[PDB]
Structure formats: C-alpha cells, structure tokens
Structure 1
Amino acid sequence: GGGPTSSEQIMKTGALLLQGFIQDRAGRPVPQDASTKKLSESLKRIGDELDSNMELQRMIAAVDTDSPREVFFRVAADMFSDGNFNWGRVVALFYFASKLVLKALSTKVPELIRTIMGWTLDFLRERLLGWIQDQGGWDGLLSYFGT
C-alpha cells in the first residue's frame, strides 16, 4: 500500500475524517484507527469552539440554502481563490460541510410538517369529525382533561 502521501490514502482518510466529523455533530459510529481517532478528536473540539462563534452562526444563518450545492462550491472556491492553502482553511471547510447538512435538514422540516399535517387532518375530517361533533368539538377534550 501507499503511505500518507499517496492520493489513495489521502482520499480514504479524508472520507473517514469527514464522515466521522459530520455524523458526530448531527446526532445532537464509524470504526477508525488510532491516529485517525486523534485527528477526529482535535476536529471535534475545534468544531465545538466554532459552534460558540456567534457571528459565524449568524453568518451561516443568512445564506439562502434552496440551492445548497451551488452554495457549497461557491464558498469553497472563494475560500481558496487567493491561491493560499493552510490546514485551518481545510478545517473550516469541514466545519462548513457539516453545517450544510443541518441547514439542509432545516429547510425540509416545514414541508414535512405540512405533508404530515395534511394526512392527519384529511383522516380527521373523513373519519373522526362526526364523532368530534358529538363531543361538542374540541371543548370536549377540555372536559376530558378536566379543564
């Protein structure tokens, strides 16, 4: 096999680190070796510090994420457009990738609540309404609760 400098190892470890990092932040498990676990620890605590950077959250909050793929490539290109590289920017990019996951979920949610409310209210109208009327409507539920 190749050592740490091979592109194959770079892609392999990159995926592990990236997956471990993102998943960690989303629950709020990926089997990995010791040095990779050590990097993941460093990653996790830095992520924690950025979660407390309140300006950044507002910064991340304001970008519209209806086209999240466009947003990612635009931010990434810009981060590295001056032709400089350093590990801090790479870290920052990872942090940003994990925030996109959460940001993206957050835009699905209202539509999901709407779809499910649709089912529930449809079922309620066609199947429970007659019975609910017999209770004198939702005030009957107040009685039930003893209010």
Structure 2
Amino acid sequence: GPTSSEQIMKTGALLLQGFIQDRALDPVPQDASTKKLSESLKRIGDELDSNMELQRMIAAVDTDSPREVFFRVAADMFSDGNFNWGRVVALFYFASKLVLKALSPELIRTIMGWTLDFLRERLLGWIQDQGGWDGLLSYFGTGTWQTVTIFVAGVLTASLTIW
C-alpha cells in the first residue's frame, strides 16, 4: 500500500526520474495518481522556472562539488526538524537543476541517488504519516500553481542564501 516504505521509495524514484526528463534509464510503467503527480510537478517546475529571484540564486552557486552543495541545501531546508510538501518539491526541483548544469551526463543517476538517499534517510517517516504520495496530491489541490510556486520558491531561495 501507499504508506509502505517500499512503495514510497518506488513512486519517489519514478516521480523524480520523470520530472528530470521534463527539465532536460528506462521508464518503468506508472499508475493513475502518479500520472497526476507528474503532471503537477511539471506545472510547478515551469512556474518555478520563471521565478526570477530563484533563478538568479540558482545561478549563484558556483559548484565544483554538486554533492557538497546538494546535501548542504537539502539539510538546510530541513534543519528545523519540520516537514512539509513544499520542501519536498523544492528538493526535487533543485536536483533537476543540478542535472541541467551537468548537461555539459552519468550525473543524472548520481544526483537521483543523492535525492532518494536523502528521501529514505530523512523524509520517509513523515511521508508515511501523510498517507504516502497522495499527501502531495492534496497539497497541489489545496492551492494554485501560482500560489504553491511562491512557497516552493521561497523555501529554496532561503536555503540557497545560507550557502
């Protein structure tokens, strides 16, 4: 079921992989909720793509160690010990941005593993408490593409600054 850790990891990999192919390994087949989730992540990422302060900040991380900056940003976004879906979206979106800079190639799988490792270690308990990824569906329903973007862009920009 969708609260099983194994299902959460699998759906998470699929959402992350499918999301990284938007902004820029074979697509194992998908379900109905996960299709709705992929469409939503695409919409948010397009909206985040046009958030100018966010893009200015992402352009500001001159990163010779993508792993260093990635774990510093993921930790900082969660360093208060709380969780919410906006931070998760921020995490996925930032991983996709690191992929884009690497387009100068095996890093897709590398960066995906960083994100799923952070997901498993730091986030899985909270997602279980949410009922699984359906929690994220609700988060997109309770709001507006343009409204949720403000908050995702807010958490990601704040974290990129500390670094």
- TM (normalized to structure 2)? 0.61
Aligned pairs, number = 139
Contact 1:65 1:104 in 2 (8 A): no
C-alpha distance after superposition, 1:33-61 (max 9, x if no partner): 11100001111100111000011111000
1:114 corresponds in structure 2 to 109
Instruction: Give me the CA root mean square deviation.
Output: 22.8
- Indicate how the Cα distance of structure 1 residues 27 and 12 shifts in structure 2: closer, same or farther if over 3 A, else same: closer
Deviation at 1:84, TM superposition (A): 1.2
Contact 2:49 2:55 in 1 (8 A): yes
Deviation at 1:136, TM superposition (A): 74
Deviation at 1:29, TM superposition (A): 5.5
- Secondary structure of the residue that 2:103 maps to in structure 1? helix
Q: For residues 131 and 34 of structure 1, what CA distance do their matches in structure 2 show?
A: 23
- Indicate how the Cα distance of structure 1 residues 74 and 122 shifts in structure 2: closer, same or farther if over 3 A, else same: closer
Give unmatched runs, 5+ long, in structure 2.
140-163
Q: Percent identity?
A: 99
- Which protein, 1 or 2, shows the higher relative CO under an 8 Å CA cutoff with sep ≥ 6? 2
- Indicate how the Cα distance of structure 1 residues 54 and 5 shifts in structure 2: closer, same or farther if over 3 A, else same: same
Structure 1 stretches of 4+ with a deviation exceeding 4 A read 27-30, 110-144
Q: For residues 78 and 138 of structure 2, what CA distance do their matches in structure 1 show?
A: 64
Give unmatched runs, 5+ long, in structure 1.
none
- Indicate how the Cα distance of structure 1 residues 115 and 58 shifts in structure 2: closer, same or farther if over 3 A, else same: closer
